[PDB]
């Protein structure tokens, strides 16, 4: 799978066609990285685009469902196999940071 | 050429299981022919016709009796048993003159070698034919991996006699 690369801050890239495209194992990385970031009832063309944030960060007691939905999004991605993810800090102020690790379809060629 | 063999070997059974006549079915055939069983070798133990042949030849009547023995379908070795050939002195056995022997202790080869390899210098006192006492003062046993090698070393050391391991 190809996909246009995004630069550091994550804006789009035009020019260098066929070269601003991520090849693989990093295309999966980019595609998971910003599949997580796709609020659900945003896109009128995909209203279940990805997990529903306005209804999960605005309600108490969803950490388990945040994690289950992140695993859902990641696993249902073209190119990933497994996941290994949990929470690493405990809302250091009130923001919790979770650690997400997944095995792409690559690095399994032995 | 690192062979497969050093991770698995598959060979044919060699010694006749080396068992002893313990059970009831330890049956014997007594010969009287001083071919191979002389006095002090009064018996030999077998569990197959071919071995009796190789010690006795398919021609001698003793191998014939072994052949008609093992040919019985439920023969003794099928129920924890052995055949043994004896020897009664039929007529005027002539025992050839022997030479003096010295059989050492049963050494396991897993303990003799590790103890030997630390022994730099050698030290023996042996006597052959009651001659002058022979002292052996250098046996660099360090380079030894099996009892055959210490056997060779002793063979080179003890003058007037031959050393074997068995």
């Amino acid at each position: 799978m190809r996909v246009r690369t995004l630069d550091d801050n994550g804006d789009w890239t035009f020019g260098r066609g066929k070269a601003d495209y991520i090849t693989s194992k990093k295309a999966i990385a980019q595609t998971v990285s910003t599949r997580i970031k796709s609020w659900a009832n945003d896109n009128p063309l995909a209203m279940n685009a990805n997990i529903d944030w306005k209804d999960l960060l605005g309600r108490k007691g969803t950490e388990d469902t945040i994690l289950r939905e992140i695993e859902r999004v990641v696993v249902q991605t073209d190119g990933v196999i497994r996941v290994t993810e949990l929470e690493v800090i405990k809302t250091e102020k009130r923001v919790q940071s979770i650690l997400l690790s997944y095995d792409t379809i690559y690095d399994d060629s032995e | 050429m690192a062979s497969i063999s050093e991770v698995i070997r598959v060979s044919l059974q060699q010694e006749g299981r080396a068992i002893a006549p313990d059970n009831m079915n330890a049956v014997g055939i007594i010969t009287g022919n001083q071919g191979v069983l002389s006095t002090a070798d009064r018996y030999r133990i077998y569990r197959t016709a071919a071995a009796v042949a190789s010690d006795f030849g398919a021609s001698s009547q003793e191998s014939a009796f072994a052949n008609t023995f093992f040919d019985t379908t439920p023969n003794p070795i099928s129920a924890g048993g052995v055949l043994v050939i004896g020897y009664w002195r039929s007529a005027s056995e002539t025992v050839a003159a022997t030479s003096a022997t010295l059989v050492s202790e049963q050494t396991s080869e897993s303990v003799l070698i590790p103890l030997l390899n630390a022994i730099n210098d050698g030290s023996f006192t042996i006597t052959v034919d009651g001659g002058t006492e022979q002292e052996v003062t250098a046996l660099d046993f360090t380079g030894v991996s099996e009892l055959s090698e210490v056997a060779t070393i002793l063979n080179s050391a003890i003058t007037g006699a031959t050393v074997s391991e068995d």
């Binding site: - | 991770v7 390899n117 630390a118 730099n120 360090t142 380079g143 991996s145």
Partner: protein, 166 residues
């Protein structure tokens, strides 16, 4: 990383005598920061001008071992023969392993051969490896293959033979 480092510009005999002592006026920031003398603030003085440590021996591994709790080590440069027993003893005395590779010239069992000297000395923690070319990396991967068992699951203790290396 949450530390406050304060370095003088000049190098060599440049003591920062103060640990941020109390001033004559103004609420004291020193104690709350952690720079305070009673506080646990390291105050390594400016070392003298350029200092030459001498050229140590491979026994300088002790300095690593007395800092890291390494449990298996290798040397990029091959341990000299004359220094193998020492490190070998070291391997036992510090409850660790040391992996070292040797080339073809050491496939003997004489006393002068250092690996066999290790074997006789019982230095079981000084693991010796063989690489015909001299390819040192064989040790690292070997090390990288051994210290790989999570000692909490069932029967995770692995042998070594016939395992993929790098």
């Amino acid at each position: 990383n949450g530390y406050f480092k304060v370095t003088s510009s000049t190098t060599g005999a440049t003591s920062l005598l103060s640990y941020l002592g109390v001033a004559t006026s103004g609420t004291d920031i020193s104690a709350v920061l952690g720079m305070n003398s009673e506080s646990g603030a390291v105050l390594t003085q400016g070392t003298d001008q350029v200092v030459l440590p001498a050229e140590t021996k491979l026994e300088g591994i002790t300095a690593i071992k007395s800092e890291v709790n390494i449990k298996g080590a290798m040397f990029i440069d091959q341990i000299l023969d004359a220094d193998i027993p020492g490190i070998a003893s070291f391997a036992g005395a510090n409850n660790m392993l040391v992996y070292e590779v040797f080339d073809t010239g050491y496939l003997s069992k004489n006393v002068s051969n250092p690996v066999w000297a290790v074997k006789l000395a019982g230095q079981s923690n000084f693991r010796c490896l063989l690489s015909k070319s001299g390819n040192r990396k064989f040790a690292a991967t070997y090390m990288a293959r051994m210290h790989t068992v999570l000692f909490s699951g069932q029967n995770t203790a692995i042998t070594m033979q016939l395992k993929e290396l790098s």
